A and B are shown apart, each in its own frame.
With several copies, the nearest count.
Chain A
């Protein structure tokens, strides 16, 4: 199999840049598998020291992203639930990944835990089917505080989507203030409809960004 990595630009609405690359070729045979060499087959390949193998997990595993807030109370019981209850190994190379070694029906599951503002953390579950993601939230919801508000996240965390929305609107309002200021020096020097058209195109280019960030926020 030939492997082919296409690169498309977003910013340019001319579709000007359609760069392709050919990043090599994969050969594979039944003999090569027969003799291991490639395969990931579990518990033998526990001590993860070929990072390609980690990456072939985080690709082929169903992912699920979850927001957590304990609003009136700090959250550190996560770190204990991972390392003692779930019996995780941290990968040293990437110390934000936890690999579950508890040897019944959570073996070969991976988590990640960014604890930004130690109330409001974010937890991401790469699992070997859905039933295993369910078995986990069940088992987790049991251990958490009473106020701990879970939530499913399709397309990013709420802080980032509000920042994205704020940026796209600030840009657009700046462009419309710019429209009116360009009109307000023409008065000192009746408007060129050509100028008005020119500025509405820039304003349209920012409105498309605000609409996008708004549909992201309005589903959440």
Chain B
């Protein structure tokens, strides 16, 4: 579907096309995301060296994205340190939380502008 987003771009929300996938199995989401990201890598590297580049805002939302990424980065680092120390509940809730982080990140992923 088409989704125009004004607080990404400074002037013109291009009417950026969003691509979604919903399933019971997170495995099939991993796979179909993996496939599509592959196809977008291909398209963007064949279009680059010919196509131009739009400007961004530089402000507010790239910083929102920085903050919400840095909290999860330090959380993953604390989780890795805990996995190295090996106290108790070796890796069950750790897996269940890491995959929560994964799902959280995947829903918006690579707004390409």
Contact = CB atoms under 8 A, between A and B. Distances in A.
Nearest to B47: A197
A180 B73 contact: no
A6 interface: no
Contacts of A187: 58-59
Given A184-B63, A191-B58, A201-B44, A207 B37 contact: yes
Contacts of B72: 173
A51 to B, nearest CB: 35
A64 interface: no
Nearest to B41: A204
Interface stretch (A123-131, A140-148, A159-167): A159-167
Contact of A197 (B37, B38, B44, B59): B44
Interface string B32-63: 01100110110011001000111111110011
B76 to A, nearest CB: 5
Contact of A166 (B44, B53, B65, B98): B98
A158 B91 contact: yes
The SS class assigned to the A binding surface is helix
The SS class assigned to the B binding surface is helix
Contact of A173 (B37, B69, B109): B69
B34 A212 contact: yes
Nearest to A220: B95
A204 B56 contact: no
Contacts, number: 136
A186 interface: yes
A174 to B, nearest CB: 7
Contact of B102 (A117, A120, A208, A210): A210
Contacts of B38: 208
Contact of B101 (A169, A186, A218): A169
Given A169-B98, A194-B53, A201-B41, A211 B30 contact: yes
Contacts of B10: 190
Contacts of A196: 53, 56, 113
Interface of B: 10, 25-27, 30-31, 33-34, 37-38, 40-41, 44-45, 48, 52-59, 62-63, 65-66, 69-70, 72-73, 76-77, 79-80, 83, 86, 90-91, 94-95, 98-99, 101-102, 105, 109-110, 112-113
14 contacts: A158-B91, A159-B90, A162-B83, A169-B105, A170-B77, A176-B65, A176-B69, A193-B55, A193-B56, A196-B113, A197-B112, A200-B44, A204-B37, A208-B34
Interface of A: 117, 120, 158-159, 162-163, 165-166, 169-170, 172-174, 176-177, 179-181, 183-184, 186-187, 190-194, 196-197, 200-201, 203-205, 207-208, 210-212, 214-215, 217-219
